[PDB]
């Protein structure tokens, strides 16, 4: 079944799985027509497509030709969102195929049942954690790839980057959500904070700062004063 | 008009024949039903006083045999039987009828109800559902589940209604996940109707059988069967014209007939919401969303 705070150990065993979050799929800014009516334009998306044993983040880039003379796009992207995922189980070779598939929005559920009929051993589940992987769209390296695409692509980021060398898989986990939350909560402040002092650098083949041990501690903390704080400015306490 | 004697009635029981019903006293000198109508099939059935657990009966069909009722006190229930002496059963009949000891099956002139539940229930499929070679006619409780059900256990007791599943490689072909579950006039047309049932005729019979084990005996998997049948209809973008408004009608009798008590139980609220107002076919049953915003608003 559900995915929740109960059974949060079972995502960092040693069964392969994936986290698949369609919310930066179709992607659109919403304009005035010169008739002074409203139009939207999309924009290039992604699927993100995590591995939580590793860091890898698996990230098919959705380019807008792929919506062009389509109708109800809201509801043809969770399908092709879908289709895309059940096309990477079936790349695979078989011991590399997930064991269960966990979506982030439970309007991905039937789409990809639906789609995965051929794997009835893939166990296809939602989840009741509040996932901040909307924000992946906030990490510079991901965001380029997905805007300078001009066709559809698929990209990876072990986005972990060397962490698992010195941290568990849990520790990473809950290092990339806290991270990935502040920059939803306040993307600007998220980033000062990361690149505030210019002698730590992002190796080229990597996602974020190359930080010490006692700088993840210091960053971790000020990463969690940013989101208390945002949900006292929000809330006013 | 023909007849179902019983032999006796030993214990006290509701008896129903088709829509209607009567109650018969303990070792009460009652030997059966007559004035059954030609031309359709009917169905017998049992609610004993003692024991509500267990609505039971039997779907036969007069042209098919002679038929009639004997309790088993070893098994506890009133058992239909054939009676192959022909001669032997005009003589137990006319003394029975010639006594007044029977009651008259209680049709209005006027009403069509049965035929209108009954019109594409053949006794030939019935038999096919429920498998049993031997006998002529078909028992049915309101246990017994379906072969659906039972995927998800005894075979031989099982009702075998055609497996409709949405989200099955039958359902679905490869290459058109979206459009075919969006849209199940495939599953309908082809896999269901050219494939599987050959004509609406027998589509249709199959969801009025359905209904009936629902409304009659309780039958939780019949009432599965009938909604899907519905529904595989009303998810359908194209289905023929004629099917459509045979549809209004075939669930308006049925939904007219259903006791107004039952419908909490009997009736599937996101079924109804979902194709009486979001389907394809919103717009398409006329008669059948008059009948149920007059009688069950409430579930809408
Ligand atoms: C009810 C219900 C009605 C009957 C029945 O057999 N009625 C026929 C006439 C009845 O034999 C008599 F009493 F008036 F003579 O059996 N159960």
């Known amino acids: 079944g559900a995915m929740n705070s109960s059974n949060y150990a079972e995502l960092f065993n040693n069964d392969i799985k994936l986290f698949v979050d369609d919310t930066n799929v179709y992607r659109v800014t919403v304009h005035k027509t010169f008739e002074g009516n409203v139009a939207t334009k999309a924009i290039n998306g992604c699927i993100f497509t995590l591995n939580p044993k590793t860091g890898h983040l698996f990230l098919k880039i959705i380019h ?7 109708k109800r796009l809201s509801q043809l992207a969770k399908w092709k969102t879908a289709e895309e995922v059940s096309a990477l189980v079936r790349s695979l070779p078989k011991e590399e195929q997930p064991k269960q598939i966990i979506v982030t929005r439970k309007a991905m559920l ?3 049942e639906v789609h995965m009929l051929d794997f009835p051993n893939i166990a296809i589940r939602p ?30 980021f072990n986005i972990y980057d060397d962490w698992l060398d010195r941290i568990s898989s849990y520790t990473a986990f809950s290092r990339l959500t806290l991270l990935l939350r502040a920059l939803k909560t306040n993307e600007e402040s998220a980033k000062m904070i990361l690149l505030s002092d210019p002698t730590i650098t992002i190796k080229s083949y990597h996602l974020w700062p190359s930080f010490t041990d006692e700088q993840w501690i210091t960053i971790e903390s000020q990463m969690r004063d940013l989101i208390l704080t945002e949900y006292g400015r929000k809330y006013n306490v | 008009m023909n007849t179902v004697p019983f032999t006796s009635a030993p214990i006290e029981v509701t008896i129903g024949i088709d829509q209607y019903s009567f109650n018969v006293k303990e070792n009460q000198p009652f030997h ?3 004035d059954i109508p030609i031309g359709h099939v009917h169905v017998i059935h049992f609610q004993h006083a003692d024991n509500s657990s267990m609505r039971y009966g039997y779907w036969f069909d007069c042209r098919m045999g002679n038929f009639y009722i004997q309790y088993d006190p070893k098994d506890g229930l009133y058992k239909m039987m054939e009676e192959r002496d022909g001669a032997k059963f005009e003589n137990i009949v006319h003394n029975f009828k010639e006594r007044q000891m029977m009651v008259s099956y209680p049709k209005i002139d006027e009403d069509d109800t049965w035929y209108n539940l009954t019109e594409f229930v053949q006794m030939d499929k019935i038999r096919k559902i429920v498998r049993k070679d031997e006998n002529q006619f078909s028992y049915v409780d309101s246990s017994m ?6 995927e998800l256990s005894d075979p031989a007791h099982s009702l075998n209604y055609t497996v409709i599943n949405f989200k099955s490689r039958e359902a679905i072909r490869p290459g058109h996940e979206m459009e075919d579950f969006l849209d ?5 047309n082809t896999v269901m109707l050219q494939g599987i049932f050959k004509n609406s005729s027998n589509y249709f019979g199959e969801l ?49 007939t259903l006791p107004e008590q039952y419908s909490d139980i009997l009736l599937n609220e996101r079924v109804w919401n979902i194709c009486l107002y979001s389907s394809f076919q919103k717009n398409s049953l006329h008669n059948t969303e008059k009948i149920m915003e007059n009688k069950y608003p409430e579930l809408l």
């Open chain 1, 64 to 70: 807008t030709s792929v919506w062009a003379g389509q």
């Open chain 1, 110 to 112: 039937d789409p990809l």
């Open chain 1, 127 to 156: 989840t009741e954690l509040r996932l901040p992987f909307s924000a992946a769209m906030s990490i510079d390296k991901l965001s380029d790839v997905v805007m300078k695409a001009t066709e559809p692509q698929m990209v990876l």
């Open chain 2, 32 to 34: 059966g039903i007559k």
């Open chain 2, 145 to 150: 589940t379906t072969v659906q059900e039972n």
């Open chain 2, 184 to 188: 199940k006039s495939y599953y309908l």
């Open chain 2, 208 to 256: 009025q059988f359905a209904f009936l084990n629902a409304m009659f005996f309780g039958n939780y998997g019949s009432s599965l069967q009938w909604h899907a049948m519905i529904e595989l209809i009303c998810s359908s973008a194209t289905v023929p014209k004629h099917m459509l408004d045979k549809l209004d009608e075939i669930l308006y009798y049925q939904i007219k």
